[PDB]
Design a protein around this ligand. Sequence first.
Ligand SMILES: CC(C)(COP(=O)(O)OP(=O)(O)OC[C@H]1O[C@@H](n2cnc3c(N)ncnc32)[C@H](O)[C@@H]1OP(=O)(O)O)[C@@H](O)C(=O)NCCC(=O)NCCS
Ligand SMILES: Nc1ncnc2c1ncn2[C@@H]1O[C@H](COS(=O)(=O)NC(=O)[C@@H](N)CCC(=O)O)[C@@H](O)[C@H]1O
Length: 180
Amino acid sequence: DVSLTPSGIKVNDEITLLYPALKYAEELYLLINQNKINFIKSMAWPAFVNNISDSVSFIEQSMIDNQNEKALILFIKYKTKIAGVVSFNIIDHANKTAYIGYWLGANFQGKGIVTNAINKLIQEYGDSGVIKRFVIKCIVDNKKSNATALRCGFTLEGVLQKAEILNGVSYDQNIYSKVI
Ligand SMILES: CC(C)(COP(=O)(O)OP(=O)(O)OC[C@H]1O[C@@H](n2cnc3c(N)ncnc32)[C@H](O)[C@@H]1OP(=O)(O)O)[C@@H](O)C(=O)NCCC(=O)NCCS
Ligand SMILES: Nc1ncnc2c1ncn2[C@@H]1O[C@H](COS(=O)(=O)NC(=O)[C@@H](N)CCC(=O)O)[C@@H](O)[C@H]1O
């Protein structure tokens, strides 16, 4: 499979899902910084990304988790730029289940980048039999994520009551799945 390269997973002619590396720290930090105000609306961690060293720490931990298959953290490269992150936040090996996370900078939204990335990951891990069940969990009112999940052929399984906390407030999540 020539799409599985040493540096990452080639989705199409424009998108590569890069294995994390320290060289990416600067660009990743700057991207997060540019999007901090909007990102804080849907994710908890951006509020605390205050310097490049925070992105270095994230990369270091991500490489450890990737090595040990605890997670699969990938940096989305669109053309020449890092566009965001797509991940298996958690890999449950015993139950062959992967929990998916993602984000894109504002300048990279509306381009199908995450839909294309997810479809590629599900082909690679799902059609190979490594993962049986893929899961997306996001806050109910996350309109754009819901659209992405449905676009990728996920099914809504239910609402997880008061399951995600942002800034001290618990919010309901939709749980979507795609089963091979
Ligand atoms: C969730 C998020 C990644 C969605 O980004 P997105 O760009 O809408 O994601 P997709 O890859 O599914 O792209 C779909 C959009 O691209 C457009 N489109 C353009 N080219 C396309 C292509 N090749 N394939 C599919 N759609 C394409 C679609 O029309 C759609 O645009 P629309 O929203 O104007 O209808 C983004 O809103 C985000 O980063 N949010 C903050 C982080 C977050 O909430 N994460 C999830 C928390 S659990
Ligand atoms: N410090 C950091 N720098 C750069 N990216 C970071 C980051 N911390 C998390 N990410 C990436 O953000 C994406 C979304 O992950 S996330 O915010 O934790 N939320 C979720 O994945 C949702 N499933 C909500 C959590 C839940 O299920 O309860 C995931 O792609 C995740 O890898």
